[PDB]
Design an enzyme around this catalytic site. Structure first.
Site, mmCIF file in Angstrom:
data_model
loop_
_atom_site.group_PDB
_atom_site.id
_atom_site.type_symbol
_atom_site.label_atom_id
_atom_site.label_comp_id
_atom_site.label_asym_id
_atom_site.label_seq_id
_atom_site.Cartn_x
_atom_site.Cartn_y
_atom_site.Cartn_z
ATOM 1 N N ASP B 9 0.848 -1.139 0.000
ATOM 2 C CA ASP B 9 0.000 0.000 0.000
ATOM 3 C C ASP B 9 0.910 1.222 0.000
ATOM 4 O O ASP B 9 2.066 1.164 0.409
ATOM 5 C CB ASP B 9 -0.728 -0.134 1.324
ATOM 6 C CG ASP B 9 -1.693 0.933 1.574
ATOM 7 O OD1 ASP B 9 -2.224 1.523 0.612
ATOM 8 O OD2 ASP B 9 -1.923 1.132 2.790
ATOM 9 N N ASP B 11 -0.347 4.968 0.591
ATOM 10 C CA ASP B 11 -0.681 5.967 1.583
ATOM 11 C C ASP B 11 -0.595 5.409 2.986
ATOM 12 O O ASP B 11 -1.196 4.407 3.288
ATOM 13 C CB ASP B 11 -2.079 6.507 1.293
ATOM 14 C CG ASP B 11 -2.093 7.401 0.051
ATOM 15 O OD1 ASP B 11 -1.114 8.155 -0.142
ATOM 16 O OD2 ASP B 11 -3.061 7.342 -0.717
ATOM 17 N N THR B 98 -2.557 0.712 -4.698
ATOM 18 C CA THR B 98 -2.962 1.936 -4.040
ATOM 19 C C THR B 98 -4.219 2.493 -4.669
ATOM 20 O O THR B 98 -4.499 2.290 -5.853
ATOM 21 C CB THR B 98 -1.794 2.961 -4.083
ATOM 22 O OG1 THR B 98 -2.147 4.142 -3.366
ATOM 23 C CG2 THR B 98 -1.435 3.342 -5.501
ATOM 24 N N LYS B 133 -8.846 -3.728 -3.630
ATOM 25 C CA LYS B 133 -7.602 -4.488 -3.545
ATOM 26 C C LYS B 133 -7.865 -5.982 -3.503
ATOM 27 O O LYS B 133 -6.944 -6.781 -3.686
ATOM 28 C CB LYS B 133 -6.783 -4.069 -2.322
ATOM 29 C CG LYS B 133 -6.169 -2.678 -2.437
ATOM 30 C CD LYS B 133 -5.071 -2.485 -1.401
ATOM 31 C CE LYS B 133 -4.566 -1.061 -1.391
ATOM 32 N NZ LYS B 133 -5.658 -0.106 -1.091
ATOM 33 N N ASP B 144 -2.274 -0.165 5.729
ATOM 34 C CA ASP B 144 -2.595 0.330 7.070
ATOM 35 C C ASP B 144 -4.098 0.369 7.360
ATOM 36 O O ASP B 144 -4.498 0.785 8.435
ATOM 37 C CB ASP B 144 -2.036 1.728 7.287
ATOM 38 C CG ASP B 144 -2.727 2.736 6.425
ATOM 39 O OD1 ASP B 144 -2.958 2.369 5.279
ATOM 40 O OD2 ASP B 144 -3.073 3.842 6.862
HETATM 41 MG MG MG Z 1 -3.247 3.170 3.074
#
Ligand code: MG
Ligand code: MG
Ligand code: NA
Ligand code: NA
Lengths: 195, 195
Positions: B9, B11, B98, B133, B144
């Protein structure tokens, strides 16, 4: 559940990249030889332009790299109507799975803008931008590129070849299948993959 | 063959979206209350801003929607170094997976530009931009966001939660795993998935 998942390629399947390239090439470089659509062979147009005359590959590339090239592509006949219907079907999830190419200033934005224009804002969540389609899982991938390769040696999708002038004369290895245009029976193809 | 495939990922894992949001929020709206990084809870920062004071969610969103927001994010400590090493490992394929979010004028371009800046042009081919995803197949997804959902009910990856202030206090359901930062032993996590 489970929903059939179909990946639909954008360039040459939903958006007329060949017609757009040829038209804008001819307008920008009117004194250069060009490749008539019927004479296209091989997925990469610029490579064929390079064989036509030295320097023509870079000129062809410059057309595709120019602002508004992707945004101004015309939809292929029946494409928007078919994908809208397909997405609306029960137990059917549609993703537009498309490459940003080696050009990122305009192409990604314009592909999102093009999808917004023809399918509406809510369809933007169905876009997967990737140079490697083998790592995207699905039941089907409808794409005009004969040879699809990448990091996954055994993709989960069946690749159905969407006819384009560059591939229309190609003999495929059985049991590879074709979708001849959006007028062709795409529902039958999807249905063959359903439980 | 087979190569382990890891989705990373961007961000909050490679790029410091929390620090960037807070800094630019504070600079643009200096007379508004803000959320200190340690007080962040829940994946969506703007939603927490909305609870802080009415109107703050839209202001927080405007920061993220502004040109150069994504491009100017700082890399998280160790992130670029770790992903470079990871990609260079034998039998290991790394993709940056992402979201473009609900914002497409700047975010996709800037994410490509950011990857080019920190990883080089050749790494651009490893980017998958997607809102979903679950339809990207891999052995691991380091991300996250605690709750990752989408069209595929049984994704092929194990989701390893990358620590962020908004998730650091979360008790996960066993046997869900964490990567605490890029200083943590990411090689051990990858190795546990290898043949
Ligand atoms: Mg993220
Ligand atoms: Mg195509
Ligand atoms: Na471009
Ligand atoms: Na944007």
């Amino acid at each position: 559940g489970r929903a059939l998942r179909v990946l639909v390629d954008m360039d040459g399947v939903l958006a007329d990249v060949e017609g757009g390239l040829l038209r804008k090439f001819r307008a920008r470089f009117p004194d250069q030889p060009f490749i008539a659509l019927e004479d296209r062979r091989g997925y990469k147009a610029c490579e064929q332009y390079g064989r036509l005359r030295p320097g023509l590959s870079e000129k062809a590339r410059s057309i595709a790299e120019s602002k508004n090239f992707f945004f101004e592509l015309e939809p292929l006949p029946g494409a928007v109507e078919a994908v809208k219907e397909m997405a609306s079907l029960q137990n059917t999830d549609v993703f537009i799975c498309t490459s940003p190419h080696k050009m990122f200033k305009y192409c990604p934005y314009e592909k999102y803008a093009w999808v917004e224009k023809y399918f509406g804002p809510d369809f933007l969540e169905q876009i997967v931008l990737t140079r490697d389609k083998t790592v995207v899982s699905a039941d089907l991938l409808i794409d005009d590129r004969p040879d699809i390769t990448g990091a996954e040696p055994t993709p989960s999708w069946e690749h159905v070849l969407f006819t384009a002038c560059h591939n229309q004369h190609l003999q495929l290895q059985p049991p590879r299948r074709r979708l001849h245009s959006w007028a062709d029976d795409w529902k039958a193809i999807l249905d063959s993959k359903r439980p």
